[PDB]
Design a binder for these strands. Structure first.
Ligand SMILES: [Mg+2]
Ligand SMILES: [Mg+2]
Ligand SMILES: [Zn+2]
Lengths: 246, 49, 81
RNA sequence: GUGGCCUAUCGAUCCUUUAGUCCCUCGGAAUUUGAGGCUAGAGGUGCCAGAAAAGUUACCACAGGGAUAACUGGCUUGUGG
RNA sequence: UUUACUUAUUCAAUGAAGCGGAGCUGGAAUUCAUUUUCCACGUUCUAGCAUUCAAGGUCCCAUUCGGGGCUGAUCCGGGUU
RNA sequence: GUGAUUUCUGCCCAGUGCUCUGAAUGUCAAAGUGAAGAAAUUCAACCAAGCGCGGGUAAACGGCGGGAGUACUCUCUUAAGGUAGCCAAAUGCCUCGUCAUCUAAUUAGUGACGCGCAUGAAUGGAUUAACGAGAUUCCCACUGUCCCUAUCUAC
RNA sequence: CUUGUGACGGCCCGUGAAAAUCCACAGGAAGGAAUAGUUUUCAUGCCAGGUCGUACUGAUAACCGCAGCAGGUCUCCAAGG
RNA sequence: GAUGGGGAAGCUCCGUUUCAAAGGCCUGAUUUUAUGCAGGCCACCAUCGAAAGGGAAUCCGGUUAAGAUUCCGGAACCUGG
RNA sequence: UGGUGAACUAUGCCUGAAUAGGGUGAAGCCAGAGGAAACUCUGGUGGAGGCUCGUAGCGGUUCUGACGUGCAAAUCGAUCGUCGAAUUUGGGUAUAGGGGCGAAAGACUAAUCGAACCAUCUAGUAGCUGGUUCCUGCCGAAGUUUCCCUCAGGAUAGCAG
RNA sequence: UUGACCUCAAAUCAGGUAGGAGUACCCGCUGAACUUAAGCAUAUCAAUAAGCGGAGGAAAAGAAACCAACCGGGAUUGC
């Protein structure tokens, strides 16, 4: 048999992400001294479109506290942020949309976004368009906060992790039908080479586990063990249940 | 062996979530069935008497 | 049309001249000579290519310094006049 | 009288194991375990003078064969007419 | 089996900049004798601006063209976090 | 995996897979423990995961039967017995199925019928405007395809 | 008609390169005049600008298809009815 | 695609700013003077990669058997000093 | 076993380039009319679409035409599909052989692909096919027995010198 | 303040050295399969071919942690 397509994807020859027209990694400002002892005020200069990303970005300018210069950070724009808005980042920042408060200093029921997992990785959770994280509870002794993720999971992270208050702009995108293979082409043309997709059941048996036969059919069960090896994991990996529930 | 797994993946969980997950898995039904069998064994003795 | 019409599309060299051997075996994109090995330090040779070793071995050129070593040895590496 | 009234009713090498001799050897010399030998059986090859063994190929390949099929021709004429 | 500890090992960030402890100065605090503690400990109407070892205060120099120290900007441990 | 829209996607977790935070001596390696021995060693206990036991899962692979009474009911068997739809269909052996229509005449076409060798529901079922160098049947126009051939030009 | 350009409008779950290089602004370091300077982003005046390529075909005969092969091979200009 | 590093028995592989003590920049000061010592500034961090991308500056007339925005005549422009 | 190829072609990236004339007439907007109001109607404007007829271009349906020791190891002629985009294409660049790439044909990877090419191991093995080079003299067969994964082959006995 | 020590650096510091070629023979690493077994998997081919590292006129080995069991021999190498 041959090496199958998902097995070939990990070499990264033609499967790397197309990153020519992207404007930089959208990270939070680094947690130096001002953000953990007070706050700092920056300005939204422009809200721009990011190639291959459903959400817009915001170019926020701060002043460097140690040197006479300007720092320009790329935030993921929250819905409601406008150009010329003052953005406040820090422990003592007031609770408004766009501010970059740590999670220990927000009450119950707060909706945040671009949430750090550990304090300092500059944004990991709820970064796609329309997604958000809800603070479910606090725990001052052994200082942690429980959060509800966009997947519905409940995480318990540190209370020193930061998050931008509000929801990510650009929500409701996937409600519009694409209607066209050309539209899907232009969508994935700036992300990576993953479309179009051929059904492995329509291949030859040298090319896929599902290939072959005088009728297009899978053969054995399509639920694959987690302990399976590379070249075997083609189908529903480690499925607890299948089928459409009612 | 069970204990290691519970600590490994289910430490950050709440009872409400646990019950929901267990039901979806169907683990809960099995526990119930075993209990029912035990009741049945006692019942059989009673019927004989 | 994989034959005669496809042979008309051939006008871009894959290999150019090499600096150590002058062979036209220097791959343009790989930046490596396929015969001698340049830019590598060692020279490409293989024991299965014994005839190629015979083609490029010592004595197939001028031996601009090595022609005189036996004669200087026979005279005993003398100095003076 | 050296099994079944007679003509059928069954099995090599290697390996393991048993019985006998309690005999021979473990090679610097001894004792005791252990191991290896000798003689006679057993564990089995039914493809039965005894390889350890699933398919597919209409994508196919090679060496050959008229020792061998799928036409015509030839012998035959059951069957057919 | 649970549970400390950190120096081995592991992960992450930064142009290794504000770590830890103590002390001021305010507020709450009830003190049962004098302070037990706990929070703070220069910035939020506005698409401006913020840099020249910092101005001021103070002490020297050898005045002049200026120069240096302390404070402004609390101490202590050199564990970057 | 299936393949726009519309309309639906029935029953079955016994098998094969996949999956559990269940319950816990059945299987049970090396290391380690104990006993016997002079030791090599032998024998036991203990014994992780996975198997084994117990659940879930079919838009997972798949599967969707017989005998009586009068479509319906009862009984056997099974995990459950083909539901809604559709059909001599590109899927029907028998088969050139039977009836109607189309023709002078039709193993072709179309519309019906259905004990369907061997239809059937994301193995997707049924329907469907527009589109097609896709496959098939009929009609009008048209003609050397033909009755039945003849003639002319260039090379 | 060809082409350049301007102000617009439509489209996107597509909003459609980077660096060298050059200029300006903020800032006020420093240098500075009166018998004299300060300015060469104003005008004129002086000197130098190295190396390699440079012919021709670009196709029913200059390229590739064994060849003077009806094949293949990127592009600019484009009169009248 | 080197270096610092880390793999690999090794030919070599990874990585391109990384767990590196990674350098040069202008003013000058001195006028035994060479360029150290007065200073002060800055932290990218090799290099290769387009004869269609970016990019300092040239046009007309004439001239040869065969060259020309390149020669000749005239008229310009840019860069460095 | 060790090397060489993405000059053809497959795919992604980077940077460039090319594409007559028509037909239909989408939103938005303007005027008129009607209505009690919701809003409807009529006439314009506008110029949308992986729309359509059709050049250049890209492709290759049929004649199963020509040719078929050809112009040609895939061409020529007519008829065709498509023609503003999932378009066509230059150059640069990346992926290398049990590997790549594949809108999936086991297709393409230099006229080579159900595992490229080059050299070596290698004079690989063959119970199978073909061949096996002067004269004369004398003698002169077998296709049968037994065993063998034996049935196109051997061993053994027989026949012969 | 000054002078040592240790450790780590920088110099177009003073002087040197390594790389590559050849490779018949030599010292190592790595390492097949064709083939034979009348099939084939252990085996064989073969501790070979290919690949990699390193020398010399030779290299390597070499003066016993040896061979022996005898009345004992006496570095290594080769026939
Ligand atoms: Mg793709
Ligand atoms: Mg299949
Ligand atoms: Zn070379």
């Amino acid at each position: 048999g041959r090496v199958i397509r998902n097995q070939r994807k990990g070499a990264g020859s033609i499967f790397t992400s197309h990153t020519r027209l992207r404007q930089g990694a959208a990270k939070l400002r680094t947690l130096d001294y001002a953000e953990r002892h007070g706050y700092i005020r920056g300005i939204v200069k422009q809200i721009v479109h990011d190639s291959g990303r459903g959400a817009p970005l915001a170019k926020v300018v701060f002043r460097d506290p140690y040197k006479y210069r300007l720092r320009e950070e790329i935030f993921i724009a929250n819905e409601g942020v406008h150009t010329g808005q003052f953005i406040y980042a820090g422990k003592k920042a007031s609770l408004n949309v766009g501010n970059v408060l740590p999670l220990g200093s927000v009450p119950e029921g707060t909706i945040v976004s671009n949430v750090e997992e550990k304090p300092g990785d500059r944004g990991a959770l709820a970064r796609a368009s329309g997604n958000y994280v809800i603070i479910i509870g606090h725990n001052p002794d052994e200082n942690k906060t429980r959060v509800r993720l966009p997947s519905g999971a409940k995480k318990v992270i540190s209370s020193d992790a930061r998050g931008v208050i509000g929801v990510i702009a650009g929500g409701g995108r996937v409600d519009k039908p694409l209607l066209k293979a050309g539209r899907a082409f232009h969508k994935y043309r700036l992300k990576r080479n993953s479309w179009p997709k051929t059904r492995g059941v329509a291949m030859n048996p040298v090319d896929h586990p599902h290939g072959g036969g005088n009728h297009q059919h899978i053969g054995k069960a399509s639920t694959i063990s987690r302990g399976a090896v590379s070249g075997q994991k083609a189908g529903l990996i480690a499925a607890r249940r299948t089928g459409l529930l009612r | 062996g069970k204990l290691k797994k519970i600590q490994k993946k289910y430490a950050d969980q709440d009872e409400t979530e646990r019950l929901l997950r267990l039901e979806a898995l169907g683990t809960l039904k099995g526990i119930e069935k075993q209990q029912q069998r035990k009741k049945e064994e006692i019942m059989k003795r009673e019927v004989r008497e | 049309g994989k034959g005669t019409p496809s042979f008309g599309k051939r006008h871009n060299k894959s290999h150019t001249l090499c600096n150590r051997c002058g062979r036209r075996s220097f791959h343009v994109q790989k930046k490596t000579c396929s015969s001698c090995g340049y830019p590598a330090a060692k020279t490409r040779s293989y024991n299965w290519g014994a005839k190629a070793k015979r083609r490029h071995t010592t004595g197939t050129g001028r031996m601009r310094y090595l022609k005189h070593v036996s004669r200087r040895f026979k005279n005993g590496f003398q100095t003076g006049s």
